[PDB]
Symmetry: D3
Subunit: 225 residues, 6 copies
């Protein structure tokens, strides 16, 4: 199976780089690649947000900001590339067809952001469609997908399995949210529907044993028609 | 003042180019650019759609389909440059920084698409925000922004002016209509909404006299806060 | 065997894209690549000529025109890349060494034009020499190579086998024709002589069963010392 | 006159950016650039070191470690540009030729690192030599060039002036200290030694008034022949 | 007026550079460029031929052989730039658009080869057409265009003037002599023929005074319609 | 075993290209690659020095000079690429990760210089570290490493085996020599220490039978902790 991992930056670099988690996920990844094709996309996280802010205080364009965020995601991506030793594609990948080449060479392509105007979630969902992958795996700072924000609405429960259409609902069906953040960012959630690619929304815990996550023996959310 | 023209491909290259119009529009741009900072983003039109449909038939990804789209828009981009002679940038522009330079060399940067995930309208709007443009002139293939697709609900007429919020509704603010065409791409519109940059929408007729157009005298829609 | 296919644009896109032919040639190609190395070069065709004209009406340089033509050939090339599914190199190739890489990865590199100053025939003959290929296959809007223009001179017969020197004659030994069109463009025909690479000039018919075309069981022309 | 500012990353982006200082330093640069040719190379600071240390943990090569470093310096480079608004080059500069252009467009080229094997100081010095700069202003995180690392041997005070040869000794001219940081990178120093270009070393305090600084009035070190 | 100088490599870098001539020719160019738009394409000379011959020995393709050629021409291109100091573009130019920019920044773009399949002469001529140059000055290693290769048929003398058609014959218009050197590359000549741009052919002697040269006063050949 | 060969330009191109040596080393290399991974780095040599000089006479920056030198090393590198037939990576490699790709494709990447500020020795030592190679092989115009310059100090003997620390001594522990030439250039010798990679310093003789050189049955110097 060809699998894509969309690792939220907040998870990889909460405040500083989570050395331990990195070593772990790397290990888990190196593990899964033994008998699967693996592509990864890393998030910017906290550090990204901070750099974005400074730019805001100088009123730079959305485009300009994105570029900065991208620079950062790529800085994080290279941390994993480092942890993955001789198993990952040598340098940060910047576009799908190059990621494709990496897969061909039986190596793990790790991507930061691509071009301006795309959240890591969206970039991941697309890198998936492009590679014609089987599963999209989202590690995030949340247990799974809840009927409502777990960190707010008390009447919020975790959904173990749902259809892309329902996911689009939970997250947000507003063309205003286009580009916002969430369990799964509105635009990515959209693509996932269009693509109908099976997605798993797990957290920092389940990520510890990807083998089970892959085969279902996990405690997250699963999305697919 | 800085203006950004969003010329429809189907307007510059209908089914088979209106050499006359092209010269007319090119000249106009030349004049306007004499006492203005002019940037121009062009469409791929019907030609693009065909090529994209073919790709659609072979179940090619969204990204690949967009590459084809971009590739064609830039073909058209060329024709304009050929028409703008020695006033335009010699090459089609691909990124905003390059477009910025053109402005410095006091030359007109003509762009096609930039990268996947961005309709021409969007690219234009984002450009207008990047360059801090004062106005965004959308020369589409329709008279203006009607209460509904003219070809669909003839119980419609245009709307000389309106709020960005009003626009988002005429084009359906459904997080799924992201990527559609319409008189103005949905996502592009929402971009204008948060940027609040004055946007005019005209047809090829008004397009014949840009000075009158940019000087508020026209028969299209003048969207803004 | 390593084989190069120089598919005339007129054949691929007569007026519009020949969907059927595309699906067929794709199928045939996907077939031949099963036990051969395959590189393709696609032509601009009708659509290319039209865009070139507009540029002429604005008196753009030969160089400028070529670029436009190239843009188009690449647009066509991507149509095949699409039809070839997961067998072709993901994106349009722009230069030999990159095409080389594609061959290494056991994928089919499809090229449009390379740089200004080279017809698809020439680009194909060269891509061949570079890859040190065994056979050059030319699909064109003609049955084969005739003693004279089939669509004019009545005393024109099809030659089943000839030497590169004779081909150079038929086509044209004038350093004035350098860059013109024909069964085989003068410059390409020249290279074919220099390279002495076996070439087969077939048409839209023979292209339907490449297996026989490859092994000789075809009805075209064969060129080789 | 042509001046090249070597702004420390830890000075522009301490642990969390001094928006105030950044505006102050950016403005200053704007003024100075009014009657001077200004080029600016920026550092990655503490942030870079962390990311590099992480890489160090996974035994990544020197080259890869430098890529990460470069990648971060250019993130910072951005923030300055965001601050320099319409006077700076829109993009971070990567090579000197590009930096040269910026100078022509009378814009300020802001650079991060260029390629592996070159500390920020070095890159700056080499730049100053490339552009034939008259002065090299090193705004580090220390008051000046002390007879010894202040944090180490408190029996030290600074040295208002000195010879390039004197500098090489304060930073240990051991062919192994090549790549170290210090108030001024060892290799960078030796570069200044053979180029003999006047170099000032100040802190963020003096950095607040560049006019006074470049006009010899400051409290740092003014290294030269 | 816009002029394009086609400086022979063997003239700028004989067997071992004429520092004197180089300064002389560089200065001249500087003066001429004061009230003219100057573009310069340079050759690889004897040095190129050697390296290419070596490649020839290992049966390397035409394309690869040209890459080596290009690679060397650009080495020379450098030396001129080093000589043109602050008036030339800092980098060797590779494409015409870049050469166009140089013209805008009122700097002299010095080019080597561009891509395979184009002799220096050709590249120059195509450049002259691209930039809409008024004259094409070919500074070859010979006095002028003789009725026959001086080193071959001593029964020859030069021809002060002539028609482009006359040129094509002195260099053999055989569709096989495409790629040869001669006083003027065959293909280059035919390019001049259809472009009909005034072309002067001189030696290093007349080359010493370009003002007199471009002002019709010289002893070479002035080819034109 | 993965092996890197740092072939001194002086050896490859003493005066002119040493055709014979090239054919030999190529043969030897093609031989060793049969059961090893091989990366090569070629030097500029005599020809490089000459071009550098001309630039010096026009007082160009160190950076500018390096670029020229690089151009040349790459010209030499392509000579080997030619000799290596269908065994080497098609074109000259310009950076490590690309060289990495070449190794993956079981091809021999031949590099000239990388970016300014690095001698071929240094570039080689680094390309080694990057690829995590087992042995660094230096062919030079000298028998091996001597206690002192063989071509000067009579009390100079050849050392058959030593530790990187001692090598750093012989060659030079001065941060002033940083960038100079020698058996092993000071900076490269430094890296070799840091990397502790086994290095063999042989000459034009031993290079004739790489199989023995590889397994120790040679007459050069060996460096390793
Ligand atoms: N219905 C929901 N279910 C789960 N999380 C939700 C929901 N609604 C909102 N959220 C929020 O989604 C957050 C999740 O994702 P997010 O903060 O964007 O991190 P990330 O994407 O993992 N990181 P990065 O790529 O660096 O941004 C939670 O911590 C919640 O505050
Ligand atoms: N409310 C509306 N007002 C006007 N046109 C509308 C509206 N709603 C939908 N449309 C459609 O918008 C179409 C307009 O734009 P579109 O087809 O996308 O062309 P274009 O943008 O000019 N060309 P190009 O850049 O090549 O795609 C019309 O012909 C209608 O079918
Ligand atoms: N002796 C000949 N034998 C065969 N065809 C000839 C001959 N002489 C001239 N022709 C012409 O060659 C044409 C063939 O090629 P051409 O029109 O250039 O198409 P193409 O190369 O297949 N397409 P493209 O790559 O898009 O240009 C025919 O249809 C004839 O009009
Ligand atoms: N003789 C000296 N004088 C002053 N500082 C010294 C001296 N010797 C060593 N140092 C050290 O130099 C440090 C200074 O520079 P450095 O840490 O490299 O910061 P930076 O260059 O400003 N930042 P950046 O560009 O992000 O690395 C001090 O804090 C000292 O620990
Ligand atoms: N009719 C002619 N008139 C003058 N030279 C001729 C003629 N026919 C052939 N030649 C040859 O042209 C040679 C001239 O040019 P060429 O050797 O190609 O040098 P170049 O172009 O100056 N150098 P470069 O750019 O490095 O190749 C002479 O030395 C002759 O051998
Ligand atoms: N201790 C030493 N042992 C051996 N050679 C020495 C020593 N000290 C100095 N040398 C010099 O090192 C020279 C060796 O290397 P060098 O001239 O730099 O050639 P290269 O590196 O092989 N070529 P290239 O890559 O083109 O510069 C000899 O010929 C000596 O003049
Ligand atoms: Mg997320
Ligand atoms: Mg539209
Ligand atoms: Mg043809
Ligand atoms: Mg420092
Ligand atoms: Mg010549
Ligand atoms: Mg050496």
């Amino acid at each position: 199976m060809r699998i894509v991992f969309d690792i939220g930056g907040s998870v990889l670099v909460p405040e500083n780089p989570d050395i331990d988690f990195i070593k772990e996920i790397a290990y888990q990844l190196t593990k899964v690649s033994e008998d699967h094709e693996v592509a990864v996309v890393v998030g910017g996280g906290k550090l990204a947000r901070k750099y974005i802010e400074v730019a805001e205080k100088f009123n730079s364009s959305e485009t300009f900001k994105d570029f900065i965020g991208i620079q950062i995601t790529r800085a994080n991506a290279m941390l994993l590339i480092a942890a993955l030793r001789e198993k990952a594609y040598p340098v940060v990948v910047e576009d799908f067809w190059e990621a494709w080449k990496a897969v061909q060479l039986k190596k793990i392509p790790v991507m930061g952001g691509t071009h301006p105007g795309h959240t890591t979630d969206a970039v991941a969902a697309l890198l998936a469609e492009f590679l014609k992958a089987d599963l999209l795996v989202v590690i995030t700072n949340v247990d799974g997908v809840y009927t409502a924000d777990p960190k707010k609405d008390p009447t919020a429960k975790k959904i173990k399995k749902m259809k892309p259409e329902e996911l689009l609902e939970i997250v947000g069906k507003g063309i205003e949210k286009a580009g916002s953040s969430s369990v799964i960012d509105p635009l990515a959630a959209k693509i996932i529907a269009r693509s109908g690619i099976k997605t798993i929304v797990i957290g920092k815990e389940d990520a510890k044993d990807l083998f089970r996550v892959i085969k279902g023996d996990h405690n997250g959310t699963t999305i697919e028609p």
